[PDB]
Amino acid sequence: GSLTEDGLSYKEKFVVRSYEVGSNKTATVETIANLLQEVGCNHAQSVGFSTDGFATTTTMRKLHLIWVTARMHIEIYKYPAWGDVVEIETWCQSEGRIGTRRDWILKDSVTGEVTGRATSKWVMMNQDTRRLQKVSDDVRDEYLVFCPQEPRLAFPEENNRSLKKIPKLEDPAQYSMIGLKPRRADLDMNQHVNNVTYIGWVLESIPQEIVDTHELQVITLDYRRECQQDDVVDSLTTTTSDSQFLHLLRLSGDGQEINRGTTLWRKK
Amino acid sequence: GSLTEDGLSYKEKFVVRSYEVGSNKTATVETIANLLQEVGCNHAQSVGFSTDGFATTTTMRKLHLIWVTARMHIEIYKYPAWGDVVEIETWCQSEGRIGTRRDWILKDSVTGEVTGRATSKWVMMNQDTRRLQKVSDDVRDEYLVFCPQEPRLAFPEENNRSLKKIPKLEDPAQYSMIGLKPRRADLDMNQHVNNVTYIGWVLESIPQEIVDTHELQVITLDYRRECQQDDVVDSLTTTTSNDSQFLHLLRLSGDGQEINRGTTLWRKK
Ligand SMILES: Cc1onc(-c2ccccc2)c1C(=O)O
Ligand SMILES: Cc1onc(-c2ccccc2)c1C(=O)O
């Protein structure tokens, strides 16, 4: 992996692994999501950020501030096959005082064609109180030297899927997977549940026949609250329609919302 | 990755990834186990085997036969850090009519030192009936051309941990993790539960304080029966012992049907 000539984006190639593929012998959406995390971390390392947190500036570390994912949006046209090489380019951009945005472009290494794209919204939070906050001049001036100054959007089109408001699923759900718990493999280096686990939990309530006859094209996921190591989750899905689904992840007990999302699937 | 000069073993280098590391910023035992299965599959591909089943010979495919893991034994001296390069060499050997054995050696790419080793026992089974069987001459002659003829063992020692009989844990267990279920990420390309998931399930019943103050040095795991996609598992652990040893049992949450038994050895950080 390496920063591009202008030092304003990062590229990395990955060979798809045997355990990373599903029933169609292509990478799962959770494998893709893991690769977006990996290329994101390597981009931050290559521009001076030191491994404690993700892209934590000097001012942020002193004020106990972290970047937290609020929304992840992934669109896949072709899932790479087992043994294929996929090249991912990533970059970040300031969104004024709201927060930051990280975008990715996935390409087939042999053909050079775009096989997928992703966009994500990140907000500033205090590590200890978990209270959100706007981005100050001091932190903006520290990370702006690593971003392209003109807009560079993975999803440029007006009125696109990445910017649509997601409603709250109403009971009763059409489908559900109850009693989902994280294991140690689901935790990151800071003992928090890996954000990719929530994508898997959302997909658990999709019926197996849809998974067997369709391919996931679009996933939009909002992160409202974290699931602790000793929390239990219920995954709910209702068809809203290609097949479209509305999703809700909530705590098995009190029904406290942790995530809401939408998926779009194409007939194979 | 590539076969060595003699074509009798395979090597591959891996850069440790951010999501593959635990609290100590080093690769977890499940990341290591995933890398053993990746280097194993690339070795089989490099010597002519198809992507259908793992190392299924021409005669095996015709008779609906597959290689299935009966035991996995892993010993780690140093877990590679996030961003470090680890080199893994793997090879196969015939164990007469019993089955085959696959061994691995893990090395630090920068120093060349052995940081871990693994050995595994594989048996022949019919895909459909699940009935075990001995290795015929026809099958042996097909895979023997890919194996070193003289013995090559990752665990040579006279009385070593990889060949010890594992007892069945007696109720009540000291520790337990109940109601463990596989999700889609836990399934392989043939929709069976990935063998690495069972290692994670075994480790789930180890208390967090042991995990926090100790490092896993040795894991020996026996595979008795497969966990289906709609099965629910209970993980049981009892301390048997500076080092801490544990006896493990994985069984179906309902009828208590045994799926795995194992042992772990941990050392104080
Ligand atoms: C870095 C990084 O880059 N992408 C993600 C991410 C966020 C949400 C869902 C999936 C991946 C991520 C993380 O810290 O989890
Ligand atoms: C190939 C391959 O090489 N190693 C394994 C394996 C088996 C048991 C536990 C961990 C990995 C394995 C598999 O098919 O699961």
Side-chain angles (χ1 to χ4, degrees):
Chain A
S2 183
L3 284 166
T4 61
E5 217 66 79
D6 65 359
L8 295 181
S9 71
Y10 188 92
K11 287 173 187 190
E12 189 168 359
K13 294 186 213 181
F14 300 95
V15 176
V16 177
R17 298 176 182 170
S18 62
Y19 63 88
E20 286 172 343
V21 308
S23 25
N24 25 31
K25 283 171 180 187
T26 57
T28 67
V29 82
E30 296 179 79
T31 284
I32 299 301
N34 277 331
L35 302 184
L36 305 179
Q37 291 187 316
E38 178 64 3
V39 71
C41 291
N42 292 333
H43 179 198
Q45 282 167 50
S46 73
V47 300
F49 295 99
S50 200
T51 81
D52 181 84
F54 174 69
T56 295
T57 79
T58 60
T59 297
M60 289 173 64
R61 209 163 300 141
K62 202 76 183 288
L63 286 10
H64 283 34
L65 296 175
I66 55 170
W67 287 118
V68 151
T69 306
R71 169 117 131 190
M72 171 55 80
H73 180 83
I74 309 168
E75 288 194 9
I76 306 293
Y77 315 112
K78 262 178 200 189
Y79 287 91
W82 166 22
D84 285 4
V85 183
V86 55
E87 187 174 62
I88 314 175
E89 178 182 21
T90 194
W91 70 94
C92 58
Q93 193 140 59
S94 322
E95 286 202 319
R97 335 225 72 125
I98 309 246
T100 218
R101 196 189 79 251
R102 174 170 295 272
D103 286 12
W104 298 254
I105 304 293
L106 294 87
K107 282 178 180 178
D108 188 332
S109 250
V110 163
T111 76
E113 85 195 51
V114 172
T115 60
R117 32 173 133 246
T119 187
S120 71
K121 296 195 176 313
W122 296 75
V123 292
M124 279 241 292
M125 196 185 75
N126 178 280
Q127 308 182 289
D128 309 312
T129 66
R130 302 179 212 195
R131 300 180 58 81
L132 260 95
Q133 64 169 268
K134 309 299 186 45
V135 190
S136 70
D137 286 26
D138 284 335
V139 34
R140 285 209 291 144
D141 297 354
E142 283 159 9
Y143 72 71
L144 254 151
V145 304
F146 307 120
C147 303
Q149 315 276 271
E150 301 98 331
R152 203 205 163 181
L153 278 48
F155 292 88
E157 320 96 35
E158 245 223 48
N159 302 265
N160 70 275
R161 309 177 162 136
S162 69
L163 308 162
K164 200 159 58 174
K165 176 101 273 320
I166 305 171
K168 201 186 184 169
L169 185 151
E170 293 169 356
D171 278 344
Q174 185 175 20
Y175 305 115
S176 77
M177 174 60 69
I178 71 169
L180 289 169
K181 302 186 300 202
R183 55 185 178 98
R184 290 202 189 96
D186 293 303
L187 308 172
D188 63 13
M189 66 192 85
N190 309 132
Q191 303 188 288
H192 291 268
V193 171
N194 190 122
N195 289 149
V196 174
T197 304
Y198 300 92
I199 295 171
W201 285 339
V202 159
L203 297 173
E204 266 308 277
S205 57
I206 296 278
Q208 190 66 56
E209 31 273 272
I210 291 295
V211 167
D212 290 336
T213 63
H214 290 75
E215 268 209 329
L216 178 71
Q217 199 188 312
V218 187
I219 182 165
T220 309
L221 197 55
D222 280 336
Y223 289 73
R224 195 185 210 83
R225 183 179 296 282
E226 284 186 38
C227 164
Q228 320 278 94
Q229 203 190 145
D230 65 347
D231 275 340
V232 180
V233 170
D234 286 352
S235 184
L236 314 158
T237 299
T238 296
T239 308
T240 49
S241 41
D242 285 4
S243 301
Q244 277 216 78
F245 300 92
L246 183 60
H247 301 278
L248 181 66
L249 289 198
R250 65 182 190 203
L251 294 176
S252 204
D254 62 356
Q256 173 93 257
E257 178 186 343
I258 60 157
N259 295 87
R260 70 173 71 172
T262 57
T263 58
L264 176 72
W265 301 69
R266 59 191 193 265
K267 249 185 66 170
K268 294 169 177 184
Chain B
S2 182
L3 284 166
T4 60
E5 213 15 83
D6 65 359
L8 295 181
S9 70
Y10 188 94
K11 287 174 187 191
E12 190 169 359
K13 294 187 212 181
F14 301 95
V15 176
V16 176
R17 298 176 183 170
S18 61
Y19 63 87
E20 286 172 343
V21 308
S23 71
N24 24 30
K25 284 170 179 27
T26 57
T28 67
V29 82
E30 296 180 78
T31 284
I32 299 300
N34 277 330
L35 303 184
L36 305 179
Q37 89 198 332
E38 177 64 0
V39 71
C41 291
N42 292 331
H43 179 198
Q45 283 169 215
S46 196
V47 300
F49 295 99
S50 285
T51 70
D52 229 311
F54 173 71
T56 81
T57 78
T58 302
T59 296
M60 292 174 67
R61 212 166 305 139
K62 176 220 179 279
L63 291 170
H64 284 34
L65 301 175
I66 55 171
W67 287 119
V68 282
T69 307
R71 174 178 278 198
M72 171 54 80
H73 181 82
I74 309 168
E75 178 162 13
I76 306 294
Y77 315 112
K78 262 178 202 185
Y79 288 91
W82 166 22
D84 285 4
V85 183
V86 55
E87 188 174 62
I88 314 176
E89 178 182 21
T90 194
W91 70 94
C92 282
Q93 275 220 283
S94 182
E95 286 202 319
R97 335 225 71 127
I98 307 177
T100 50
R101 196 189 79 250
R102 173 170 294 272
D103 286 12
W104 299 253
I105 304 292
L106 294 87
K107 282 178 180 176
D108 187 332
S109 250
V110 162
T111 76
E113 85 194 26
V114 173
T115 60
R117 43 184 191 156
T119 186
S120 70
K121 297 195 174 314
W122 296 75
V123 291
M124 185 113 64
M125 197 186 75
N126 178 279
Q127 306 181 282
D128 309 311
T129 67
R130 255 58 229 260
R131 301 180 57 80
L132 297 178
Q133 64 169 82
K134 308 299 187 231
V135 189
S136 69
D137 286 24
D138 284 335
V139 171
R140 273 221 314 284
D141 297 353
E142 283 159 10
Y143 72 71
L144 254 151
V145 304
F146 307 120
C147 303
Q149 314 277 270
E150 301 96 335
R152 203 204 164 182
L153 325 182
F155 292 87
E157 316 96 85
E158 204 142 298
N159 300 139
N160 71 93
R161 309 175 162 135
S162 70
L163 308 161
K164 201 157 59 175
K165 174 107 117 286
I166 305 171
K168 201 186 184 168
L169 184 152
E170 290 171 351
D171 278 344
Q174 185 175 20
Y175 305 114
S176 76
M177 175 60 69
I178 304 311
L180 288 169
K181 303 186 300 188
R183 54 186 180 97
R184 290 200 188 96
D186 293 304
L187 308 173
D188 63 12
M189 68 192 87
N190 309 132
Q191 302 187 287
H192 291 269
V193 171
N194 190 296
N195 288 332
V196 175
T197 303
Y198 299 92
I199 294 170
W201 286 338
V202 159
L203 297 173
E204 267 308 278
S205 57
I206 296 279
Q208 190 67 56
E209 317 90 272
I210 287 291
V211 168
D212 290 335
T213 65
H214 287 76
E215 278 230 309
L216 179 71
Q217 203 186 314
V218 187
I219 181 164
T220 309
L221 197 55
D222 280 336
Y223 289 73
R224 194 185 210 82
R225 182 180 294 281
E226 189 171 63
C227 166
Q228 249 99 270
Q229 203 189 146
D230 64 349
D231 275 341
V232 180
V233 170
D234 286 352
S235 184
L236 313 158
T237 299
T238 295
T239 308
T240 49
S241 41
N242 277 62
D243 284 2
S244 300
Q245 277 216 77
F246 300 92
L247 182 60
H248 302 277
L249 181 66
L250 288 199
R251 65 183 190 203
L252 294 176
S253 214
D255 62 356
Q257 173 92 73
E258 178 186 343
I259 60 157
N260 295 87
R261 70 174 71 172
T263 57
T264 58
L265 176 72
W266 301 69
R267 75 174 300 114
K268 238 195 62 186
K269 293 161 182 190

